[PDB]
Ligand binder design. Structure first.
Ligand SMILES: CCOC(=O)COc1cccc(C(=O)c2nonc2N)c1
Length: 468
């Protein structure tokens, strides 16, 4: 008998799993929402704003109407290489955003020490990818890495049709703080990461006015062999591709059809992405420079550190946010959470979802969300930033691990507005002027210098329909 080779691996379920971490793909959780679980791990936050600040230049006429296509191609070339490193070193890419990706090595508490060593080595090899790389003579193209370790909580929230997850807690807060302190080419360790790590392996230096540390060198003992050390470490890595599948970047490439599993996983993925996955839309349809309105919602909690309390609060907020977005065809593109609160990146005018009055409706949606979420138990402060303009949309990452993402100055602007103008709904000049709503519905705001934005233009508070 002949033995034709090659398992077929391109099923819809596999395509869906590309959009999700192993944390979710192999998770098998209870149906209750919210769902919380608790574990330990090492986190890596890779700041990629260096080359995703390239976006505004790809809107130039020099790119001849293929700005979006060129941008995704070059971004994916670089981001792919980072993803491959993470995956080969045993990590799980949790989410992508325009300015970062977050990766996790989940392990039993006793192995944190050795896993930190693995993650440091991975971090250094990532920097090594970019040592002599650039573009257009100028732009150097490099990254900044923060590492953290310790207790991690996971939250899954959603309804009967849509799901979202977050990791939260001090280690999560720590990784953001660490990455923020990094300069180009740095690997910064959280205080706890430094506490837990194998101090014989590395040389560090202090970070002024900070207990976090910078890794200067990974200098292992005389008879250390990283490959043998790594192999020992794989004992504790549940899904590391091995044996017959050692040639694959992800076990998830081996997923077989399973309608119950696919039902669960598809809830995390936007319907337009599922359309492409099902070969009912062209594979490049979602790469675009598109005018949109960003509504960036931040929720700050009464007790910032109590997972048992924040979980239900996020779920209650989510249920309202989704009902309000449905009414005006808005979408949640990402949910993020560090030390600054839980933020929902909402978008109006996505792929094939554009309708006029996007602006008045975006503001009215923001106010509804603001009013409702302000009365949610345990939510201390709600802040919403509204910015409108051309943004890049597309699927960013590696073939095996990628996500639909939005990138642009207006996304960053809305995100900064929600943090620098807490407790109110703010909007940019495009939104204010475009709405044609009466001027007394707004308050002209003081100009604030916000990290990452030059010339925001005049900013406004959406005060609402009444003096009240
Ligand atoms: C408004 C703050 O926006 C950002 O910081 C975006 O950058 C990222 C990039 C990757 C993951 C995350 C997360 O916050 C989480 N992903 O999963 N759990 C999280 N927490 C955030």
């Amino acid at each position: 008998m002949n033995t034709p080779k090659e398992e077929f691996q391109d099923w819809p379920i596999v395509r869906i799993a590309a959009h999700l971490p192993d944390l979710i793909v192999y998770g098998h959780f209870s149906p209750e929402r919210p769902f919380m679980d608790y574990f330990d791990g090492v986190l890596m936050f890779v700041d990629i704003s260096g080359f995703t600040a390239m976006t505004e230049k790809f809107s130039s006429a020099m790119y001849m109407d293929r700005g979006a296509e060129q941008l995704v191609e070059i971004l994916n070339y670089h981001i792919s290489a980072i993803v491959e490193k993470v995956l080969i070193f045993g990590g799980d890419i949790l989410k992508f955003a325009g300015d970062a990706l977050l990766a996790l090595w989940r392990v039993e508490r006793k192995q944190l020490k050795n896993i930190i060593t693995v993650v440091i080595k991975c971090s250094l090899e990532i920097h090594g990818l970019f040592e002599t790389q650039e573009w257009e003579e100028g732009l150097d193209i490099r990254v900044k890495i923060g590492l953290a370790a310790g207790h991690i909580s996971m939250l899954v929230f959603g309804d009967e049709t849509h799901s979202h997850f977050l990791v939260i807690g001090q280690a999560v807060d720590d990784v953001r703080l660490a990455q923020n302190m990094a300069q180009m080419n740095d690997v910064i360790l959280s205080p706890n990461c430094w506490q837990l790590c194998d101090r014989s392996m590395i040389e560090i230096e202090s970070v002024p006015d900070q207990r976090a540390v910078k890794v200067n060198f990974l200098k292992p003992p005389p008879n250390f062999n990283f490959d043998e050390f790594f192999t020992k470490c794989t004992t504790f890595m549940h899904y590391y591709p091995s044996g017959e599948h050692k040639n694959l970047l992800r076990l998830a490439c081996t997923l077989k059809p399973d309608p119950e599993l696919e039902m669960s996983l598809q809830k995390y993925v936007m319907e337009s992405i599922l359309k492409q996955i099902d070969n009912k839309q062209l594979q490049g349809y979602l790469s675009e420079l598109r005018p949109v309105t960003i509504v960036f919602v931040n929720l700050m909690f009464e007790d910032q550190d109590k997972a048992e309390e924040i979980g239900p609060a996020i779920q209650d907020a989510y249920m309202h946010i989704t009902s309000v977005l449905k009414i005006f065809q808005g979408q949640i593109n990402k949910v993020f959470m560090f030390d600054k609160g839980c933020s929902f990146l909402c978008v109006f005018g996505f792929p094939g979802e554009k309708v006029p009055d996007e602006l008045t409706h975006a503001l009215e949606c923001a106010m509804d969300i603001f009013d409702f979420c302000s009365q949610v138990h345990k939510i201390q402060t709600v802040s919403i930033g509204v910015a409108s303009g051309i943004v890049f949309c597309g699927i960013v990452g590696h073939t095996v691990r990628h996500e639909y993402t939005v990138i642009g100055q207006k996304v960053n602007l809305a995100a900064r507005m929600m943090m620098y103008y807490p407790g109110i709904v703010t909007c940019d000049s495009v939104t204010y002027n475009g709405s044609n709503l009466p001027a007394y519905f707004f308050k002209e705001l003081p100009k604030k210098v916000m990290k990452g934005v030059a010339d925001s233009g005049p900013l406004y508070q959406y005060w609402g329909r009444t003096e009240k």
